[PDB]
Amino acid sequence: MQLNITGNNVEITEALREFVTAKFAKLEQYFDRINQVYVVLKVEKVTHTSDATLHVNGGEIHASAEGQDMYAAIDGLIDKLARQLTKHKDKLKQH
């Protein structure tokens, strides 16, 4: 539901909020246990990072990504997040 955003050290520009929104938006089309997230995006020197904490049913999975984009970690975060949401579902269906 709620995509919580943290622009600490960053902007969180409305138009980029769109970028980040669409991506988790994709994600939600595969996993229906999700309640809410809080994502925190911050840039330092070269590496422009992103980290979130992700609530599944009661939650929670969490993870972080680097890159020199600030768009990279966006691409990354999802990817790591994805792997662990899939684990979430399987081994669970395996009980």
Question: Which positions lie near RNA, rule CB under 7 A?
Answer: 4-9, 29-32, 38, 40, 44-47, 51, 53, 58, 62, 68, 86-87, 89-91, 93-94
Tell me the C-alpha to C-alpha distance, in Å, between residue 44 and each of 50, 63, 68: 11, 18, 10
Q: What is the DSSP letter of 10?
A: S
For 6, the 3-state DSSP assignment is: strand
Taking the complex as a whole, the smallest distance from the CB of residue 32 to RNA amounts, in Å, to 6
Q: Which is closer to RNA, CB of 31 or CB of 71?
A: 31
Q: Which is closer to RNA, CB of 22 or CB of 57?
A: 57
- Alpha carbons 89 and 48: distance in angstroms, whole number: 30
For 33, the 3-state DSSP assignment is: coil
Taking the complex as a whole, the smallest distance from the CB of residue 40 to RNA amounts, in Å, to 5
Taking the complex as a whole, the smallest distance from the CB of residue 39 to RNA amounts, in Å, to 10
